[PDB]
RNA sequence: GACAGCAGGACGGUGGCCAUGGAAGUCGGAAUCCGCUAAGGAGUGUGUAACAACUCACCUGCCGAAUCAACUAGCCCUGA
């Protein structure tokens, strides 16, 4: 992958081939995290291969949709799981984001994933995306951001690079 | 008042107790000559003398202690000439004379009246423990005597 | 974790005054006042209640040897609280060898003159900082009484003194001489 | 000798912790070095008596 | 473990709550397991001694089981050492009045309060030498027949003052009697009664 | 009602058993239980050559609600 921006939440269904002797495939389902949905059909053979006996020439799909935010308007919690692959030896792993929607949440994980543990889109495998609501987040920062009447101000915030003149009088202040 | 916990012979090859002894001097040979009367016969192996002293003598008191006993408790006489076969051999049946000697055991316990003396005196043997016909984990747990006919 | 507001709370009695300007806090009670400097910190210092005087030492987001150090100006405007109360007295007795050490003071008790100084000839002068007073205890052998106001100050002259007297080039587990920093309190007792 | 005395002159130089590799007196109740020029390990020993 | 034990410990004070309902209310701050061992083996005949952290703390949970007269009273009263002792017999005002035994006083580091200890001219009766303690003090002492004595009266530990290890060590081996404290009796409970033992009881 | 912090207790059998210059929880070999218990491990360390004193496991007094341990990999440091 590359994670090229925000990513997109895609249902792919996928089947094998109607072999005479074995018709009617199982018709097998996931939930593919991609930038578009030539990546998603590929990461879906990737994850499928894994799992079963499937491949690329011997199956086909048959539906890769968007899936739309079911309350883009609300700011959720979600738990991501992770199977990510470090230097050493590869890890499991769970995590938590405040953030609104789905794509938008496994999008800070790719980044924060990045970020932090240096991971490459490659070694990320996304287990399972899960909503929780309150009073179940582990994390102690979304645990911090659990808080009604929340109070912060903005200290020391200082911008435009140069939007002002680069030879003013003035020397800026913040706040 | 003099209290030692020592026995094997007499010794009296230039080594002694008697620190507390020459404040009145009177034992440098003659409280030894009384130790080893009543040291004859009682025994061959470690005990626990206390000698009450009163300006003229030595009143020679042996207080019986547990495993003291346990050992006294063994066959008798092992000194010298063939030893080690090997430290443990310890085949003894104790079934009364445990309770007897915890009978004689007084004000030196905080002890129950004969309730758990029992297991006290069987898992604090390091030789013997039981008659060779069972296991001492059934000692421990199986005996509902003595707590009646003791006290 | 970039964690939300942690704030400590003082309380300041009535015998004392505080005033602050910005970071910069002003303590003026019964032994004299006391000035201080917080310019490198950024840690906001806001007081509340009319005539109540509960202080408050509040940070935003930060980080965690951040939120270490907002506990470090609640605790530093305790101690000045407590020097301006009580004050500060350390007791210093001489632990000395086969030779004995003559402590004396020259100038108002702001210069502490060291001599026979484990047998050395060379007589050894310790200038103090300005604001704390010294002066050789009464009714008990060879102690050194630094009295002041700021427990930086004075606990920086103590430990000139200590490291003044000092064995040199020998081992320093034998030799146990020298004049130690014995007892830390305060100058008005039963408070 | 003042016994008293040796008490805390022994608590001033002697109940130290001595690490093995960046040879710091530190603390009696140390775990780490505190000097950057071994790695702060936790490789102490007591300082030696008599 | 500690689950097992403590719903045991709490079937041994339902046990006793429903067996004993006199209760007294005593303390051990000065205690020893030579002290408990003789009041314990004084007392086998007699009322029981129990102790315990916040489990003793078990009259609320009692109370609000609703099978009880008013024994929610002693809840404010379980603060700073505080240990029960159940009895049946008494009915009875003579007890530990005539029980408070005298327990060593043997000499150790901490206590300050409350007497003073006098050593008059009075020989030590101890082996050779017996003279470093009193040098490392400082006693005028001299040498008669064996048995050395002290020339001077002075005073070794004042009130309020602090024992330190050499004097310990000294008092153990002349065996001058040093501070002995026992228990402290607090509050009597004798079925629901409010006993105010500042003097009503005894 | 935990982690910390401060304070108190840390026994009886028993100076246990093989040893001998001593082992009386502390060089060693084996073992390893019970009573009082609120709690004591035939004992985590320090010490005197031993006997002794100190501390810890364990329990309790005050405080008061979150805390501790072992691994793992990202930056940086020591290794250099
Ligand atoms: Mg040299
Ligand atoms: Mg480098």
Redesign the pocket.
């Known amino acids: 992958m590359k994670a090229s921006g925000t990513l997109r939440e895609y249902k792919v269904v996928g089947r094998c081939l109607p072999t005479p002797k074995c018709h009617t495939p199982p018709l097998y389902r996931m939930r593919i995290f991609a930038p578009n949905h030539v990546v998603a059909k590929s990461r879906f053979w990737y994850f499928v291969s894994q799992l079963k006996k499937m491949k690329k020439s011997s199956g086909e799909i048959v539906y890769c949709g968007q899936v739309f935010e079911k309350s883009p308007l609300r700011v959720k919690n979600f738990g991501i799981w992770l199977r990510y692959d470090?230097?050493?030896?590869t890890?499991n792993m769970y995590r938590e984001y405040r953030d609104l929607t789905t794509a938008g949440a496994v999008t800070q994980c790719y980044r924060d994933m990045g970020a932090?543990?240096?991971?490459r889109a490659h070694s990320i495998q996304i287990m399972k995306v899960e909503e929780i609501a309150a009073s179940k987040c582990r994390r102690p920062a979304v645990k911090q951001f659990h808080d009604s009447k929340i109070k912060f101000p903005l200290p020391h915030r200082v911008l435009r690079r140069q939007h002002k003149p680069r030879f003013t009088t003035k020397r800026p202040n913040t706040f | 008042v003099y209290?030692?916990?020592?026995g094997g012979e007499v010794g009296a090859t230039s080594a002694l107790a008697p620190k507390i002894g020459p404040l009145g001097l009177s034992p440098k040979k003659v409280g030894d000559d009384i130790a080893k009367a009543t040291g004859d016969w009682k025994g061959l192996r470690?005990t626990?003398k206390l000698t009450i002293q009163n300006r003229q003598a030595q009143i020679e008191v042996v207080?019986?202690?547990?495993?003291?006993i346990?050992?006294a408790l063994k066959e008798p006489p092992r000194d010298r000439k063939k030893?080690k076969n090997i430290?443990?051999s310890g085949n003894i049946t104790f079934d009364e004379i445990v309770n007897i000697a915890r009978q004689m055991?007084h004000r030196?316990?905080?002890?129950?009246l004969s309730?758990?003396?029992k297991?006290?005196?069987?898992?604090?043997?390091?030789?013997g423990?039981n008659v060779d016909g069972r296991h001492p984990h059934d000692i421990?747990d199986d005996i509902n005597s003595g707590a009646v006919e003791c006290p | 974790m970039k964690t939300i507001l942690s704030n400590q709370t003082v309380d300041i009695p009535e015998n004392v005054d505080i005033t602050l300007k910005g970071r910069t806090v002003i303590v003026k009670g019964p032994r004299g006042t006391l000035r201080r400097d917080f310019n490198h910190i950024n840690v906001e210092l806001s007081l509340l209640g009319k005539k109540k005087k509960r202080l408050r030492v509040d940070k935003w987001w930060g980080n965690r040897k951040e939120l270490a150090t907002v506990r470090t100006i609640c605790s530093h405007v305790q101690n000045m609280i407590k020097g301006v109360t009580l004050g500060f007295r350390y007791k210093m007795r001489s632990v000395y060898a086969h030779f004995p050490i003559n402590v004396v003071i020259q100038e108002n008790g702001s210069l502490v003159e060291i001599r026979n100084f484990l047998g050395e000839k060379y007589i050894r002068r310790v200038r103090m900082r300005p604001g704390v007073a010294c002066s050789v205890s009464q009714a008990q052998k060879d102690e050194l009484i630094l009295e002041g106001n700021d427990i930086e100050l004075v606990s920086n002259s103590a430990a000139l003194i200590q490291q003044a007297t000092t064995v040199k080039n020998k081992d320093i587990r034998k030799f146990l001489d020298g004049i130690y920093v014995s007892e830390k309190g305060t100058v008005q007792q039963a408070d | 000798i003042e016994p008293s005395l040796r008490q805390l002159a022994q608590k001033y130089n002697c109940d130290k912790m001595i690490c093995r590799?960046c040879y710091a007196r530190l603390h009696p109740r140390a775990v780490n070095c505190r000097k950057?020029?071994?790695?702060?390990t936790n490789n102490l020993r007591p300082k030696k008596?008599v | 473990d500690?689950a097992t034990?403590?719903s045991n410990?709490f079937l041994?004070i339902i046990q006793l709550l429903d067996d004993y309902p006199k209760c007294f209310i005593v303390g051990?701050?000065?205690?020893?397991?030579?002290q408990?061992?003789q009041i314990?083996?004084s007392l086998?005949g007699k009322a029981?001694?129990?102790?315990?952290?916040?489990?003793?703390?078990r009259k609320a949970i009692r109370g609000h089981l609703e099978n009880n007269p008013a024994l929610e009273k002693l809840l404010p009263h379980?603060?700073?050492?505080?240990?029960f002792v159940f009895t049946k017999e008494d009915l009875t005002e003579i007890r530990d009045m005539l029980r408070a035994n005298k327990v060593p006083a043997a000499a150790?580091?901490?206590?300050i309060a409350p007497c003073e200890v006098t050593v008059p001219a009075q020989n030590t009766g101890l082996g050779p030498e017996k003279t470093s303690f009193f040098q490392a003090l400082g006693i005028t002492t001299k040498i008669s027949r064996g048995t050395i004595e002290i020339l001077s009266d002075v005073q070794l530990i004042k009130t309020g003052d602090k024992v330190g290890?050499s004097e310990?060590?000294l008092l153990?081996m002349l065996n001058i009697s040093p501070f002995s404290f026992g228990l402290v009796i607090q509050q009597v409970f004798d079925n629901g009664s409010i006993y105010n033992p500042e003097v009503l009881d005894i």
Do not use: F
Request: one cysteine or more; aromatic letters at 2%; charged letters at 25%.
């Open positions: 470090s230097r050493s030896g890890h932090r543990h240096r991971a | 209290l030692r916990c020592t470690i626990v207080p019986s202690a547990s495993a003291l346990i050992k030893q430290k443990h055991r030196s316990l905080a002890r129950e309730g758990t003396i297991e006290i005196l069987g898992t604090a043997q390091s030789v423990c421990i | 590799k950057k020029k071994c790695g702060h008596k | 500690r034990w403590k410990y041994k051990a701050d000065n205690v020893g397991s030579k408990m061992q314990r083996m086998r029981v001694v129990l102790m315990g952290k916040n489990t003793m703390m379980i603060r700073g050492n505080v240990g150790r580091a901490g206590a290890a310990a060590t153990n």
